[PDB]
Each structure stands twice: as structure tokens, then as C-alpha cells.
Design an enzyme around this catalytic site. Structure first.
Site: not given
Ligand SMILES: O=C(O)[C@@H](CF)OP(=O)(O)O
Ligand SMILES: O=C(O)[C@@H](CF)OP(=O)(O)O
Ligand SMILES: O=C(O)[C@@H](CF)OP(=O)(O)O
Ligand SMILES: O=C(O)[C@@H](CF)OP(=O)(O)O
Lengths: 272, 272, 272, 272
Positions: C26, C60, C238
């Protein structure tokens, strides 16, 4: 466009008329109770100037236990509405589940209900159609408001043109209901402008029974269909969510102070 | 954890066993048809090595018109499964609506179904419980999978411990169904690991009948409950969405090439 | 109808081709980790015969605390993919949030992602359009699959015709996601048959990461976009729901044993 | 429990205070228009006794076409609110998309909005937090009301404690919004009882703009956030659903006749 009228005796239910309250209780526990509970309604109704119809189930065809309390039976139940009618001069709306119970209840009561989970049971409608009594169709949790015409349609064929539509919210994910306020007008339209009533207590599956019922009413309805227990706290089982009886009145002032204020607005059109 | 078995005669339905197909047709139009339609199944089943149960309704307690075709009647219907049983040595699963039709159909058939819209009608379960035949509970569109234990529970009390759970998707806004693949395991768990089957055709309310049934099966099920018509195009009314009969086989190869491949995987745990 | 191809270097992503896995982690915690985590993928990929693209966020832009770990920064992040590329000869897909970070990451990586919550930010697309690199659009939780054409459209204008669509489920009531398997084909169709990939781990917000990814794959996809941590249990914060690294391989056998079996079926049409 | 106050100058926004209308227009087409449109508000506001804040976007960071009208630019836009402020002594609430536009707009306006699709962009909040101006957070279609505390939380850290929460409905299946009236109180509670306002026009994606806004208001809000065009019919593109300007007043009487009637009720508790 003028609204339709499905008058229950000296009562005239309609979308433009002042709201008619179909209060009451859920299941018929005991007359000693039915009457204490009903007692308050009649008092608060008359006193506040609100049409009223007592409501109570004489049966529960659905539960999570057969070894449970089915209900006062179709026979020992009708008799209770009897001592009730006389003693208070109020109408009796009770639901039905099997085609056979149709005509009976028709005689003992005024308004008869079609259980949501069954709003789509031809065999029972074509039968609840014979009595020819006022019908209250509970909008199934799983059905878009625009599909309500067909139920009202089918009833017409059964030779019954006195129907009211009751909304108890729509499915919002697993285990949850949300009431789409916009759906009230959508139902009026497809039902030949039939009386649309808002079943608030089971629309909630709370301190929300008011805020939620103020929003519905501030839209314009033919009435509310509520439920309440004298001591919810201890009876709190599951199914609907009854109102604290003592708060009946102070809560109904909320409504009239709205069901009127709104029921008398110069037709608006934010359309064009 | 080992899976439960609700064997229908020489048939052993279970979550770890190879999928059992409960194909068939929707309503019983005419035997001349029931048989042409059933004809193909039996052929493709035997030939492809897939357990099979013919399915067809002998009644439609729900429609949008009473002046319509109710169905072959509870009497003239049972007789059709008769000439059917003999002529093909296949089991007969048909739904029931009124408590009285319970025990009868029980004798004429093998598997009996509880109509989704009624999965919560005690009066009919405590009755479908007496026959003691295999029961197939159609998961109500409006009920989270984790609440399926109680239905399976209530049946146990009625003295029936042979139940199968059928999933036909969940409400996704007004007028629409989506099938939550994650719900299949949630149902296995709360139902004492009872047989979970996927009702694909009405889960769709298409060219999607495959892609949608490949996803279900690529999860692991006790079987599929499908429907098909020889000429859907012209029969296309509404309720479920039948499969083009000619495509029965080429479509069932899709499944076995999956219901097996997956049904024989070394238990995985992406948990820990 | 033949499928479109959005080849990432020697990699050919497409709906009919064998699935391409865009695994990874992630957020980029530390290289010592990025590499242990990436280490396993490359091994299991090569060994099992599965195209692969490492994926990890270097930032993030969304959390529930600013006083938290934003991320390895747009600068100190690109450098990590550097030591990564060389050491493993694997492609790098990382998301971007501000228009300025577009062109940079383009040079350090192969595949660039458009964050779901932003799939509708013209200012950032018309910019991610300039680099002209392969784009991966995360399907917003709040958008019907049929509306995905317009995003793919807008990209074309920005002069970019190399896009892939990633599905991470749809809103099902408050706080919950469900993945509509039928939506995979709906996206292929409106996107000029562009590569459709299934973001399983955040589609779950479990022991479900498999059963849920087996259903997707048993439909046919251009690939899976998964995530995993070596010790989820303790990192379990989370956002997405990572996979237990040790189970990487045994879980990918599940897929190939499907992404193939299905990827090589004689075109079926349950339509006519 | 007393309500919080996020006063915009001589304006005191709060849940128990009388509703404050944040009317206006959607995008800033041309001043000649901004002013005709704004013209009516100010008139109807003053005349009917309703607090008011003009609202208009000086930019549209989201569309389905880049070759389209982005908007009056962050520069040539601020200047328009200028000639506006003076000429009418009304506050200016406009949304922002990139962190850089934060502090500027802060000086030219009173109330600044955080775009729903971005309510979860730390980088932009920690920035909209610096100006320290009143913030209006548009509740994301895809987020349960109980999760709104965290946004209000994060703002506090950025050193900003003047926030208002705006509700524009929740996802109800693909392509559809429904406004859960019960969510208004749920937001008050988790936001330190911050001002909750109802964005009605995009909550509808109609002749429903009233019935839908009467229900919200008949619950009790810190205000409505509406939009309108002088000739919707011909401008009807897509995004929000503006109100027929001429109906501004007759429609606002609906509200006051409610935002008051209800805003002055003796606290009720249908709880105990
Ligand atoms: O795509 C992902 O992996 C995640 C990781 F946090 O965030 P997002 O909701 O923008 O996709
Ligand atoms: O309507 C009611 O009051 C209740 C009472 F249980 O049941 P149903 O769900 O059939 O309406
Ligand atoms: O299950 C079926 O096949 C169908 C057939 F109409 O009806 P029901 O919705 O009760 O299941
Ligand atoms: O809030 C608004 O008025 C509109 C205007 F387009 O856009 P957004 O969806 O970001 O709120």
C-alpha cells in the site's frame, strides 16, 4: 390535479386534506393494554383535532420463532376490536395474512391492511378485493415507489377502488432502511393520486421518530401510521420501533403544526 | 469444518461436493413443453456428469394481473410432474404458497421451495416443516445473508433439518439487483454450513447469465438454480430471465470446468 | 469483438490475454520492507508464470490525521522505485495526486494511477494526459460502471490513449462495499474494450480476499490489483485490506487455475 | 445540549438559530448574469427576513470535457465577487480545488467550501486550514454521516475550528441519490454539534426541489444551500439542478414557514 378520497366512514382520507393518524399498537397483547394504549390516542386526537384510526395486529405471521406468540387469533382478536369500537367510537385497521381472514375482519373493522411482504400476492389481493373495504397497502421495502400503480391496479380489478398506500422506507444496504422523501409524490402520481400515508415507526426498524416524521409530514401526506407502547424500554423486542405513549400528544403537536402549515400552501411549481 | 448434506434421494447436495444443478423452467405452460425443455437438461446432465433436479412452478401467486395465468393448479400440476418423474427419473422441485399445498407436493416431488417473498411466513414454514421434505429457501432480496440462520433455525423446530439456501441477489437502489459474492460464505457459516445454491436467472431480474454464474461458481457452491426457455426472445415477459435452451450444454461446460477446478482446491486461508 | 491492448513495456495488458497481476504493497514504509515484500512477488510471479507489476504508494493524500505519515515524499519515493527497478526488472505503478507530480513519476515508473476519489478531476487528468504514460483509473465507489467511458474519453483528448480501468466495488448503504460482477463487462463495452482490472483488496475496505477474487477472475479480467503485508495482523490500520504475504503463491494458483481455464473458453452467447 | 456557532461576519450560523440560506448560482457565467441572479436573492432575502450568503463557483475542476469551460479563473473570478460584495453587502462562498487557491479566496470572500469529492484530501485541508476562514464541507455522496467527525477533527488540527457540514444526499444504487433525513442529527452529534446545512439542488443530481427541501427543513437545519438559474430549461446541462429564479421567493416562504415553526419547538424526546 385534485386528490383522490378513500373515506373510512365519516373519515375522509386524502393527500390535500389534513393528515389522518392511523396510530395504535403493534400486536394485541391484552385488552387491558389495548385499551390503556388506545385510551390515550382518542384523548389526544379529539383534544388536538386530528382524525384517528386505532391500529393493532391480531396476528404476527412472521417472527424468528414458532414457539412464540402468534397472536390473539383471528377469532379472539375480532372480539377485542368489538369492545373497543363501542367504548371509543374509533375505526379499526388490522392486517390480514390468509385469504380466508379477509371478509371476517372486514365486518369487525373499517380499514384493512395488506402486509408489505405480501403486497405481491395475487391470491390474497383478489380476495381482500371482495370484501370491498378500504385497503392499506404497505409499500414493500424492496419495491421502487413507481411500481405501486400495479398493486392499486390489481385491486381495482378485484372490484375494489378504495386503497391507501403506506410507505415504510427502502432498503439501504444490508440491514437498514432509509425513507426517500421524493418517493411520496412518485406514489401519489402512479396511484391515481391515491392517499399516501407514512409508516414512520417501521421505517426505523428512536429519538428519530420525530425528526424523521417531521420531514415526511413537511412534504404533505394523507396521514401518518405510527405505533407506540406505554413502556417501550422493557418491551423493546424487534420488528417496529414504538413511540413512548406519554409523548403521544407533544409529538402530535409537531405534526399538526406542520400537516396544516404545509397542507395549506398555494400550489407551487419549482418546475418551470 | 466439514459441510452439511441435504441429500435429495440418491443425490447428495453439499458445499464441498460437486455442484448440483436445479435447472428447469419457470411456470408450467404445457407438458408438451415441460418435456421438450426438461428433455434437454436430462440429456446434457447425464452426458456432462452433473447432478440434476428439474424445477418448474405449477403456480404463480404473484403477478401484475389477476385476469392472468395463475398456473396449472395445485392438482393438474402434480400430475404433470408424475408423467415427468417416470419418463426421466429426475427429481422435482416446485415452490408452494399456501400451507395446505405443503404435504401434497411433498409426495409428488423431492425438493420443495419456500418463495423468497415469504421466507418470513411462520404459518407456512411450520407447515412446510411437517412434510419433512428437503426445503429450498430463496434468500429474500431484502435480507442480509447473516440473517439466514433464523429461517434455517425455525425449520429445525418444525422438525425439519433438511434445508438448502438459495441466493438471488440483493437490492441495489430502486429496481435493481446485485449479487454480493461475499454473501455466499456468510450464509454457509450461519446455516450450520447448509447447502448454498445460486439462483442466477432471478438474480438478473441476458448475456450476463454466464459471466454472472461463472463468478458465483468460482467461489464454490452446492449448485446453481437456473431457468431457461426454448425461445426466450418471444416469451420474454417478466419475472426471471431464462436461458436460451440450445446454449444449455455449452454453458454448463463453463460451470463444471469451474465447479470442479475450484471444488478441489487445497483449503486456503488468506486470513492469518 | 477483439480487446484493446495497453501494453506496459514488454507487458501486454488486455481482456482476452492472460491476467496481469499488479500486486505490491500500500504505502512505502521503508525500502528494507518494500523489497522483502516485492521480493516474494517477483519470485512467485516468475515461478508461476504470471505477468507482474509492483505497486506501492509513495504518498497518502488522504487520512484521518495530518499529524500522520504523509509518505516517502514525491522525491525520496521515486528514488526507491529506482533501486527497485534495477534489482528486479519489474514495472512500477504508483498513484499521483497533484498535477505537478505527473511527468516526474512518469519517468521513474511504467504504470501511473489516477486515485478513485479524483477520477473526476479534469485539471489532473489533462495533466496525467501529458506524460502520455499508461494510466490506471480506479473506478470511484460512487460511480456506475457505464459512466466510465467519459473518463477514458477525456484522457484521449489529453492525447493519451493508453488507459486501464480498475474496479474496487460499489457503495452498498452506509459504510460498505459490494462488487457487482456484471459491471466488469459494462466497463469493457463503454471503454472501447479497454483493459479492466479488479482491485480486490480495496473492494473489501479478510478470508474473503480469495472467494471474492475467484469470482471476479471467473468472469475474465485483464488482471488483479492486489496488496499484501508480511504481517497484516499487526499493521492492520485501515484503508485497504492487505493479503498475508506467505499466502501469495498458494493464492495465485487459485487465479491462474481460473484466469486461464476461463481465458480460453469458446466465446459463448447466452443472449440469443 | 446547545449548538455550535460558526458566524460568518455579522451572520451567526447554528443548528438552533433560524436557517441561513447559502443561495446563489453554480458556475460564474458572466457578471451581467451573476448580478441579475444575485439581485433577486438579496431582494427576497431582505424582504422575507432570511440570512443570506451568495454562492457561485469561479471554477469547475470536474466535467466530462477538458475542451470545455473550466471557469472564470482563480484571478478573474475573485474580482467578480469584488464588484459583487460592495454592490450588495452580501457574503461570498466559493469552492476551492488546489491548495494554492486557499489563502487568496479567503481574502476576497467570507465562506469557503471544500468540494465533496475532495472532503478526504489532507493536503488541501491542512491548507484550507491556514487561512482560518469559515469552511463548508460538502458531505461526500460515498460517506456515512457518522464519519464526518474526522473531517471536522482534521480541520481543528489545521488550527481551524469554524466549519459547517453540508449534506447533498447518499448513493442509492448506480446513478442515484437519496437524502437520509436521519443523517442530519447523526452529523450534528459527531461534529461537536457544528452547523449542518442541506444542499438540496445537488441532492437531486425538479418539481421536487421543494417537497425535498421541505422535508429537510422540517427536521431543523442551520440552513439550505440552494442554486438557481433564471432560465434552467435552456441551461439544463448537468451537475446540479438549479431552481427557477422567479420562484425564489414563493419557495423561500415555504422554508421560513417551516425553519421557524420548527426552529421554535419545545425540545422533544421520543427516546424515553
Ligand atoms: O489504491 C490504493 O491502493 C489506495 C491506497 F491507500 O488508496 P486510493 O483509495 O486513492 O486508491
Ligand atoms: O405493519 C406493522 O405494523 C407490522 C407489525 F409487525 O408488520 P408488517 O411488517 O407486515 O407490516
Ligand atoms: O423462484 C422462481 O423461479 C420464481 C418464479 F416466478 O418466483 P419467486 O420470486 O417466488 O421465486
Ligand atoms: O457544490 C456545487 O455547487 C457543485 C458545483 F458544480 O460541485 P461539487 O460537486 O464539487 O460540489
Amino acid at each position: 390535479m385534485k386528490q383522490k378520497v378513500v373515506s373510512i366512514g365519516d373519515i375522509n382520507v386524502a393527500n390535500d386534506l389534513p393528515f389522518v393518524l392511523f396510530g395504535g399498537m403493534n400486536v394485541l397483547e391484552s385488552r387491558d393494554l389495548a385499551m390503556r394504549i388506545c385510551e390515550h390516542y382518542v384523548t389526544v386526537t379529539q383534544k388536538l383535532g386530528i382524525p384517528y384510526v386505532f391500529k393493532a395486529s391480531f396476528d404476527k405471521a412472521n417472527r424468528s420463532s414458532i414457539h412464540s406468540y402468534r397472536g390473539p387469533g383471528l377469532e379472539e382478536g375480532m372480539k377485542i376490536f368489538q369492545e373497543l369500537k363501542q367504548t371509543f367510537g374509533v375505526k379499526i385497521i388490522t392486517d390480514v395474512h390468509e385469504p380466508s381472514q379477509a371478509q371476517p375482519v372486514a365486518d369487525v373493522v373499517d380499514v384493512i391492511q395488506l402486509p408489505a411482504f405480501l403486497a405481491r400476492q395475487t391470491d390474497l389481493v383478489e380476495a381482500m378485493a371482495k370484501t370491498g373495504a378500504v385497503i392499506n397497502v404497505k409499500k414493500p421495502q424492496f419495491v421502487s415507489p413507481g411500481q405501486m400503480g400495479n398493486i392499486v391496479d390489481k385491486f381495482k380489478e378485484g372490484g375494489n377502488e378504495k386503497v391507501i398506500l403506506c410507505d415504510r422506507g427502502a432498503n439501504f444496504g444490508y440491514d437498514n432502511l432509509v425513507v426517500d422523501m421524493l418517493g411520496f409524490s412518485i406514489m401519489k402520481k402512479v396511484s391515481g393520486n391515491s392517499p399516501v400515508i407514512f409508516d414512520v415507526t417501521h421505517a426505523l426498524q428512536r429519538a428519530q421518530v420525530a425528526e424523521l416524521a417531521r420531514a415526511g409530514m413537511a412534504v404533505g401526506l394523507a396521514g401518518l401510521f405510527i405505533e407506540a407502547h406505554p413502556d417501550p424500554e422493557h418491551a423493546k423486542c424487534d420488528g417496529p420501533s414504538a413511540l413512548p405513549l406519554a409523548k403521544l400528544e407533544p409529538f402530535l403537536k409537531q405534526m399538526k403544526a406542520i400537516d396544516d402549515l404545509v397542507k395549506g400552501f398555494e400550489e407551487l411549481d419549482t418546475s418551470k
